[PDB]
Amino acid sequence: ADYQGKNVVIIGLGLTGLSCVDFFLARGVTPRVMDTRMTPPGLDKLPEAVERHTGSLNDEWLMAADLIVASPGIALAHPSLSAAADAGIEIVGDIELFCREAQAPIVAITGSNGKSTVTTLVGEMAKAAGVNVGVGGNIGLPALMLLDDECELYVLELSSFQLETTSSLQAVAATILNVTEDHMDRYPFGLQQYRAAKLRIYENAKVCVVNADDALTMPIRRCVSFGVNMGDYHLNHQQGETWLRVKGEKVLNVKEMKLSGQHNYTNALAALALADAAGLPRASSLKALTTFTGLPHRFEVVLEHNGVRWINDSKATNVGSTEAALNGLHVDGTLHLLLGGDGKSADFSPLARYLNGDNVRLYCFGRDGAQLAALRPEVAEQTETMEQAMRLLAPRVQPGDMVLLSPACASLDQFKNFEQRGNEFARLAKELGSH
Ligand SMILES: O=C(O)CC[C@@H](NC(=O)c1cc(CNc2ccc(/C=C3\SC(=S)NC3=O)cc2)ccc1F)C(=O)O
Ligand SMILES: [Cl-]
Ligand SMILES: [Cl-]
Ligand SMILES: [Cl-]
């Protein structure tokens, strides 16, 4: 693609928006930037030569554009964008710009849960093979910041929103790990619309990797599969022990892994399927499975002290992710579960099946605190903030208990992002969890 001479408008700043601005400037094109936020992240880093409009969209700019580059954070359904689309003005996002330029194969990973873990794992598999790998996209560096002629493989986590604006991906291996209700504030045609955005990832993929246990991961019209009891890649339980298997053959006893739990084992299978499809040596891929320690904010033990485990699962921003934390969870004493934030119109009811018994307390905060407390009012307390909830629960914590932040919601009503929420949790855990 050649952008020279084009009127380019970038919607949405932050680090990803800035990478788009830099991409065009480096190619001798000065874009214009708009953002519905008054002082969006990164505004102070935007070069003065770049015109910007903030606090709303500017329809004069949009309707004048030859190319609109939309952040995943702006809905394509926004009236100003739909008007531009109706006028035949081309709309793409950062991932599309990247795909048009990339000179190495791309492994592309999406899903409602597991996508950052699987992306990171495949990245580690590549590193163990001595491959010069660029890992990022929806986590780490924005994709355009990874673009480098020396890269031999890219491994990109892609959100449903980025996929909506992407048309030129031809992944060497693409997966949807699972699809569970999320982002309903952005998908007014509900679960199937959200699924449809993710299904885009398979278009022109050389290999598709699907979840044998999740029918929604399958194309609507074969694919390689992973699963628990079935799939090309699957688990073999051997009295106390679990193995990763490929087509009947044992490849790894999960005792060699640092990660634990069934859904981490299926994330391991999906990573291995992708790595195999990308042509990575199977041996170095298995080695990476043994060294990988997990991501911050993903069921992360931030303090184990005085008989109490304090677990930061702030990355649980939907119901499916909290279900994964709670399903099969062992707690010796009482589970003190922190729930809250912006639930994005999700149905929280699927959590209620994990919340019976005499050994659960709920501490519910943020925008949807009351709806969360409603899951089981008799064991629930509601506060405005997570700090209030922590200070409420801490005096009640006894040796043997677990304190779990796995909030099932976005943090964006009260925090910059789920990392900030997790870090605040960890700070407070360390204060409240020792003498
Ligand atoms: O950190 C959390 O707690 C929540 C995270 C969590 N985030 C998203 O929904 C999400 C966020 C991003 C990040 N990128 C942006 C970029 C711009 C904006 C906001 C804009 S752009 C514009 S113009 N006007 C805006 O307000 C928001 C997110 C990308 C894909 C996603 F699935 C969620 O899954 O609930
Ligand atoms: Cl507006
Ligand atoms: Cl119980
Ligand atoms: Cl208190």
Side-chain angles (χ1 to χ4, degrees):
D2 189 345
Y3 304 105
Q4 188 175 343
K6 298 295 194 205
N7 184 320
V8 173
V9 173
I10 291 168
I11 308 178
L13 205 47
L15 189 61
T16 300
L18 287 162
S19 74
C20 294
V21 169
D22 294 345
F23 173 91
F24 285 105
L25 292 175
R27 289 161 181 68
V29 174
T30 304
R32 290 199 284 189
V33 167
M34 62 185 60
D35 194 301
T36 63
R37 299 168 292 183
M38 197 72 61
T39 60
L43 183 58
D44 287 347
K45 314 264 172 308
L46 188 64
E48 199 187 356
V50 175
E51 295 176 65
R52 77 298 299 276
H53 173 101
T54 63
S56 56
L57 301 185
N58 182 326
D59 288 330
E60 287 173 3
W61 296 8
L62 287 177
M63 292 303 291
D66 299 312
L67 180 68
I68 293 164
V69 181
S71 169
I74 189 80
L76 286 174
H78 187 290
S80 288
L81 276 70
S82 64
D86 287 347
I89 298 172
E90 180 173 23
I91 296 163
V92 303
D94 78 310
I95 298 308
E96 176 65 16
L97 297 176
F98 177 84
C99 287
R100 292 165 172 198
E101 307 301 326
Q103 296 295 321
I106 296 162
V107 176
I109 297 148
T110 195
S112 303
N113 195 38
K115 62 181 173 293
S116 300
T117 297
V118 172
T119 295
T120 300
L121 268 182
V122 177
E124 299 301 306
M125 291 175 175
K127 289 181 168 95
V131 174
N132 183 311
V133 64
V135 185
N138 189 51
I139 58 168
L141 295 182
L144 294 174
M145 299 183 77
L146 301 175
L147 256 186
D148 187 308
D149 281 352
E150 288 187 84
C151 192
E152 294 175 318
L153 182 68
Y154 295 106
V155 184
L156 300 184
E157 177 182 323
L158 299 184
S159 62
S160 67
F161 303 141
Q162 285 172 312
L163 284 166
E164 294 185 53
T165 56
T166 305
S167 53
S168 306
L169 177 70
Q170 304 192 46
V172 71
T175 187
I176 306 175
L177 297 174
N178 44 68
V179 182
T180 68
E181 183 184 59
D182 198 1
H183 299 301
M184 295 286 107
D185 56 329
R186 280 276 298 265
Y187 294 108
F189 296 79
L191 188 67
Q192 296 307 311
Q193 187 187 20
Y194 174 47
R195 183 191 179 201
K198 293 195 182 301
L199 289 169
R200 302 178 63 81
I201 203 166
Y202 294 136
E203 276 288 298
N204 301 305
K206 180 187 187 44
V207 175
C208 45
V209 173
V210 302
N211 186 342
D213 297 311
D214 183 347
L216 296 191
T217 67
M218 283 152 212
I220 285 174
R221 261 144 185 184
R222 65 253 150 198
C223 299
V224 173
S225 63
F226 70 89
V228 167
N229 301 127
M230 54 184 159
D232 299 315
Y233 295 68
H234 60 271
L235 307 178
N236 178 43
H237 306 274
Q238 286 299 351
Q239 78 280 345
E241 285 197 306
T242 306
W243 292 81
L244 317 184
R245 299 217 305 193
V246 186
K247 299 192 159 64
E249 177 173 332
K250 282 176 176 64
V251 305
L252 188 72
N253 180 327
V254 306
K255 75 182 180 176
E256 295 304 320
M257 282 179 60
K258 307 282 209 23
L259 298 178
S260 309
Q262 193 169 266
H263 70 288
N264 276 330
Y265 307 146
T266 56
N267 285 338
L269 297 175
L272 189 72
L274 298 162
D276 276 353
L280 298 178
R282 161 76 65 70
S284 33
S285 299
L286 295 167
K287 182 73 194 166
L289 287 172
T290 76
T291 56
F292 181 60
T293 54
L295 294 173
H297 321 284
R298 187 41 92 196
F299 211 91
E300 180 189 3
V301 182
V302 298
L303 178 69
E304 183 164 353
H305 185 72
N306 290 342
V308 182
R309 300 179 296 245
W310 301 73
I311 300 314
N312 170 11
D313 196 38
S314 182
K315 194 56 173 142
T317 52
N318 58 44
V319 166
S321 191
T322 301
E323 259 195 86
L326 299 176
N327 186 28
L329 182 57
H330 172 71
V331 177
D332 291 305
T334 303
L335 171 68
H336 302 272
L337 175 62
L338 289 113
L339 300 174
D342 176 4
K344 293 162 277 174
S345 296
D347 183 5
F348 299 121
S349 309
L351 298 175
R353 75 182 290 253
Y354 303 99
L355 307 176
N356 306 312
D358 307 315
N359 299 310
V360 180
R361 306 292 185 274
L362 310 177
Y363 305 84
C364 302
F365 63 93
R367 192 185 163 171
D368 293 339
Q371 287 58 34
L372 288 157
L375 286 167
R376 197 173 165 200
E378 331 85 67
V379 304
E381 297 256 24
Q382 191 195 156
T383 57
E384 170 172 11
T385 68
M386 182 182 75
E387 178 168 355
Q388 292 165 342
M390 286 283 276
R391 293 188 187 286
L392 186 66
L393 69 87
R396 317 187 168 156
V397 173
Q398 307 287 354
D401 287 6
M402 176 179 291
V403 179
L404 174 57
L405 171 68
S406 186
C409 300
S411 72
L412 304 182
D413 61 312
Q414 297 171 313
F415 300 88
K416 179 164 70 159
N417 50 38
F418 71 84
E419 286 98 337
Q420 187 183 73
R421 172 174 72 187
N423 292 330
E424 284 181 18
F425 174 82
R427 199 170 301 119
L428 288 165
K430 290 167 175 162
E431 184 199 331
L432 297 167
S434 66
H435 309 284

